[PDB]
Amino acid sequence: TGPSLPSAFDILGAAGQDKLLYLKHKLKTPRPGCQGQDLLHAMVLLKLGQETEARISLEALKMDAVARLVARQWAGVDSTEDPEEPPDVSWAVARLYHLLAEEKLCPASMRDVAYQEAVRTLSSRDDHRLGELQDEARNRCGWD
Incomplete structure (x- = not known):
C-alpha cells in the first residue's frame, strides 16, 4: 500500500x-x-x-x-x-493526492499521509522550504 505516483x-x-x-x-x-x-x-x-x-x-x-x-x-x-x-516526489505526490481527495476519488486520510511523508522527507534533509510545506500541509489537511 501507500500514497505514491503509481497508486495515484x-x-x-x-x-x-x-x-x-x-x-x-x-x-x-x-x-x-x-x-x-x-x-x-x-x-x-x-x-x-x-x-x-x-x-x-x-x-x-x-x-x-x-x-x-x-x-x-x-x-x-x-x-x-x-x-x-x-x-x-513526495511534495508533488501530496499535491496530487490533495486534488484526488477533493474530487472524491480517494479518502482524505490518503492526502494526510502524503503531506506527512513529504514533511518527513523535507526534514530529513533540513530543506529551507520545509516551513512552506508545513504551512501548505496545515491548510490543505484541515489541521496540524
Missing part, C-alpha cells in the same frame, strides 16, 4: 472513463490554490491513452523535475540530456 495513476484508472474525461476537461484551465493540476492533467491524459497530448503538456512542464520523471517513465519520452538522479 491506479486511482485515476479506477475512476472510470467518464470521470477521466471530466478531469481532462476541468483540469486543463488553471485555478488559484491548486498546484499540481497541470501535472495531474497530463497523468489524466496518459491514463486515457492520449499520449501525444500528454507529451505536449509534459514538455510545457519540463522545468519541473517531477514532470520530467513522468515524461520519461510514464510517457516514454527519452531524455535528451545527461543522466540526472530521480527527484524526491
Whole structure:
C-alpha cells in the first residue's frame, strides 16, 4: 500500500472513463490554490491513452523535475540530456493526492499521509522550504 505516483495513476484508472474525461476537461484551465493540476492533467491524459497530448503538456512542464520523471517513465519520452538522479516526489505526490481527495476519488486520510511523508522527507534533509510545506500541509489537511 501507500500514497505514491503509481497508486495515484491506479486511482485515476479506477475512476472510470467518464470521470477521466471530466478531469481532462476541468483540469486543463488553471485555478488559484491548486498546484499540481497541470501535472495531474497530463497523468489524466496518459491514463486515457492520449499520449501525444500528454507529451505536449509534459514538455510545457519540463522545468519541473517531477514532470520530467513522468515524461520519461510514464510517457516514454527519452531524455535528451545527461543522466540526472530521480527527484524526491513526495511534495508533488501530496499535491496530487490533495486534488484526488477533493474530487472524491480517494479518502482524505490518503492526502494526510502524503503531506506527512513529504514533511518527513523535507526534514530529513533540513530543506529551507520545509516551513512552506508545513504551512501548505496545515491548510490543505484541515489541521496540524
